[PDB]
Amino acid sequence: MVTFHTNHGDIVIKTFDDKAPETVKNFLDYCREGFYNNTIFHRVINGFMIQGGGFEPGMKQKATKEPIKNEANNGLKNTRGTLAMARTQAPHSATAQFFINVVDNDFLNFSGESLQGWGYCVFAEVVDGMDVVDKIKGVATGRSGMHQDVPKEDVIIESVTVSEH
Numbered sequence: 001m002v003t004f005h006t007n008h009g010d011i012v013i014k015t016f017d018d019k020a021p022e023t024v025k026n027f028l029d030y031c032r033e034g035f036y037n038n039t040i041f042h043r044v045i046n047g048f049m050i051q052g053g054g055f056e057p058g059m060k061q062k063a064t065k066e067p068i069k070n071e072a073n074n075g076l077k078n079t080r081g082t083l084a085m086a087r088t089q090a091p092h093s094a095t096a097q098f099f100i101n102v103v104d105n106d107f108l109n110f111s112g113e114s115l116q117g118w119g120y121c122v123f124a125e126v127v128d129g130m131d132v133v134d135k136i137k138g139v140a141t142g143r144s145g146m147h148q149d150v151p152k153e154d155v156i157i158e159s160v161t162v163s164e165h
Helices: 021-032 130-137
Strands: 002-006 009-015 039-045 049-052 082-085 098-101 122-128 141-144 147-151 156-162
Touching (some): 002 021, 009 021, 021 122, 021 156, 039 130, 122 130
Antiparallel strands (some): 002 009, 002 156, 009 122, 039 147, 039 156, 049 098, 082 122
């Protein structure tokens, strides 16, 4: 279990370790090491998703570890409340950034091991705190340089709690 302690409340997450083993290992390593502490949700698009795990207040992008294999061929779907890894164009480019689907986003789902089909790897889901996710998704946003949909007031992950068996 992972809990993001945000300045708007707790987001409580169950991870799908066996379905996305490299992804969950990467995520938990960042959690346990404090990487997500003092990071923001820097991209909030109502009716789509909320994204974080990369920037400190002031839009300061942190150094990450090397990227991970895309495990989206695990059959898990980007339904409302799931977490998936953000990434750039290359399939195996995810590092620390993740997003929470706020509606079902079928168009993000894996359809093939290809540039257009690889999709976005689901590795966890919110089990409590969707009210907090729903508060975040409705905040006022604007531009920061190249970035769009940046909350005008910082939505901050202050700390995390990891519990494992």
